[PDB]
């Protein structure tokens, strides 16, 4: 097949002009969508804050208006998912992955409205869920919509425009352009076959997405950590250790999300009325814990810089970690619309801090800063649970800008993905798709 290759080599990287321009518009819209979704979430959390002050005398009515304000918003988000687009429940990365395998539909006329408005309900109430899940599904659906509006034909167009929408989606959620591309190239792509996803086109959409985000967000960074210290060579083996601890934890957390999806299904049986009521109680618990112990609830981005600076006690970090493991499962396994990606950065940080502070007191000769271990651990639950380590590493690098830590970040991530493989765990997005494709057949 040599003369075939000579021809193909000579025809490499000539994506059709139409796909490239359309990639541009897909990115722009995904950017504007993500910006809007981001401001919408914030505006409701505010309304909720200003409610708690018209009510800040009567501590009992305080805890009540915290609970019902988030209960109402939660149910609303649960309800529109079950009523009009059930595949907008949970994250949405597994379904956009399925769409890329050509085994799940991109029902953009229904998911766009429910995922956007349903996510605002669940995130805006202060549930432990992220923007990533929403913005990538919303971004994929936006890809499909542009495809259907302009009736572009071919496998290339359908796969690329679907890929760039979910890439521009992650980029715009984190101000993280390199992470978005890599998430497609390492995780979301069809993993067992070649595809004609143009990468140059995914690149164009990511740019425009990221430019839209900078237009409405500049001057303030998602996570500001400052510059931490360097890592001496004789410190590296400690990051490997930390990796191995993430590698054992990764899969165990994956059991919990899945079996927790099972358990909480038992509660409502599948009934949209018991279900919406269940999410109303989970939502009320978060908006309540949001007042009574904020680090137990919410997306968790707030406590990342705090934990990195060593300003939490070890007692607090253990408490937060347990609690947040708990509230993270309850919210994502419940099937509320919204991601688990960003709360895993939090869980990783908190854990890595606690390792760091043990490492500082065991080795004063190392001159450790617990913060370097928090930075190594941030993308570590990502590496051992969803097994996209190159994406977590580039994402953490883009968000915290401590490139001098690249080696302990790599090392921690690979140990996590190595010990997750070696202890019998699977990529969580793939094991969520697989279970979803396994009852889209067992009903026959």
């Amino acid at each position, epitope marked *: 097949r040599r003369r075939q290759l000579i021809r193909q080599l000579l025809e490499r990287d000539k994506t059709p002009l139409a796909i490239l321009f359309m990639a541009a518009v897909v990115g722009t819209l995904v950017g504007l969508a993500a910006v809007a979704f981001d401001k919408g979430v914030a505006w409701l959390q505010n309304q909720r804050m200003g409610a708690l002050v018209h009510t800040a005398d009567n501590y009992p009515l305080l805890l009540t208006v915290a609970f019902l304000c988030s209960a109402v918003l939660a149910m609303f988000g649960y309800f529109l998912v079950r009523k009009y687009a059930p595949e907008a429940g949970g994250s949405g990365i597994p379904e956009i992955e399925g769409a890329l395998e050509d085994q799940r539909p991109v029902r953009w006329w229904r998911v766009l409205p429910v995922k956007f408005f349903g996510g605002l309900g669940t995130l805006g109430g202060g549930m432990v869920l992220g923007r990533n899940g929403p913005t990538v599904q919303i971004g994929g659906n936006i890809g499909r919509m542009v495809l259907d509006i302009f009736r572009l034909k071919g496998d290339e167009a359908r796969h690329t425009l679907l890929a760039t929408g979910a890439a521009a989606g992650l980029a715009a959620a984190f101000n993280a352009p390199l992470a978005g591309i890599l998430f497609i190239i390492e995780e979301m792509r069809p993993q067992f076959r070649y595809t004609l996803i143009s990468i140059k086109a995914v690149f164009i959409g990511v740019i425009m997405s990221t430019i839209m985000y900078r237009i409405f967000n500049h001057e303030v960074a998602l996570i500001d950590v400052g510059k931490l210290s360097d890592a*001496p*060579l*004789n*410190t590296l083996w400690l990051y490997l250790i930390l990796g191995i601890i993430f590698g054992i934890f990764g899969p165990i957390f994956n059991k919990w999300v899945l079996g927790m999806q099972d358990l909480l299904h038992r509660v409502h049986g599948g009934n949209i009325t018991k279900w919406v009521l269940m999410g109303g109680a989970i939502g009320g618990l978060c908006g309540l814990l949001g007042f009574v112990a904020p680090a137990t609830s919410g997306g968790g981005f707030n406590l990342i810089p705090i934990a990195t600076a060593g300003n939490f006690s070890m007692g607090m970090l253990v408490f937060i970690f347990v609690a947040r493991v708990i509230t993270t499962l309850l919210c994502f396994s419940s099937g509320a619309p919204g991601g688990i990606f960003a709360p895993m950065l939090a869980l990783g940080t908190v854990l890595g801090t606690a390792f760091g502070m043990v490492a500082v007191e065991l*080795f*004063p*000769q190392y*001159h450790l*800063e617990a913060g370097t271990f928090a930075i190594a651990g941030m993308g570590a639950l990502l590496a051992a649970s969803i097994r996209a380590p190159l994406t977590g590493i580039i994402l953490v690098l883009e968000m915290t800008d401590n490139y001098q830590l690249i080696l302990p970040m790599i090392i921690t991530g690979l140990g996590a993905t190595l010990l997750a493989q070696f202890t019998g765990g699977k990529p969580l997005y793939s094991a969520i798709l697989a279970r979803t494709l396994a009852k889209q057949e067992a009903e026959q």
Partner: antibody
Amino acid sequence: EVRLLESGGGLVQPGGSLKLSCAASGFDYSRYWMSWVRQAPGKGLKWIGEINPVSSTINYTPSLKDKFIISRDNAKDTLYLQISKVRSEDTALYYCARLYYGYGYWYFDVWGAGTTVTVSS
Amino acid sequence: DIVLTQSPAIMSAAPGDKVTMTCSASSSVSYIHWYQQKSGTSPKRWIYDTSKLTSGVPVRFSGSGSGTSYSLTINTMEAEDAATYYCQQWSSHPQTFGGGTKLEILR
């Protein structure tokens, strides 16, 4: 150049206190751990203590509760050493050092000239 | 703490001649440093990580060793090599210097 200029060492009466000062010039003095080492008359080098750039960690040699107090003010770019209940054992040349590492086994990167403490009635 | 003991506590040697001092530890130690001090002068970092020369340290100088015993060496002594040579460990905490080795000219 990179300069360490320590001052504040003089004659002090037994049981007194004193506050030595190291003035850093010619390098970003944030970023660096700073250290005190002293040399008693005709004797070897003895480590006092170290402070990290954010004063969040300060270690001292195995030696009594509020004997030494190391602190830094990275704004004026100067390192400090308070000595208390000073006895003649504290008669020494006092060195201020910038700390670094190669493979990660920490060494005394650059030293100042010293100041001499004499404690005597 | 780790005790480091430098061996020929004082010693003399003619110029253009091969000198060798020792450092020895109560326990095992890793990547030892060596500082050179002339009277009236700040100590100068001389050799680090048991074997590595500092920027400017002439090539005649060299270190070696492992575990519990280490060494400094000057293949061809010069005159400006007259000084005191302190070995230093931070493999353990807290870090400890040696007693010193004073090296003076022979004439």
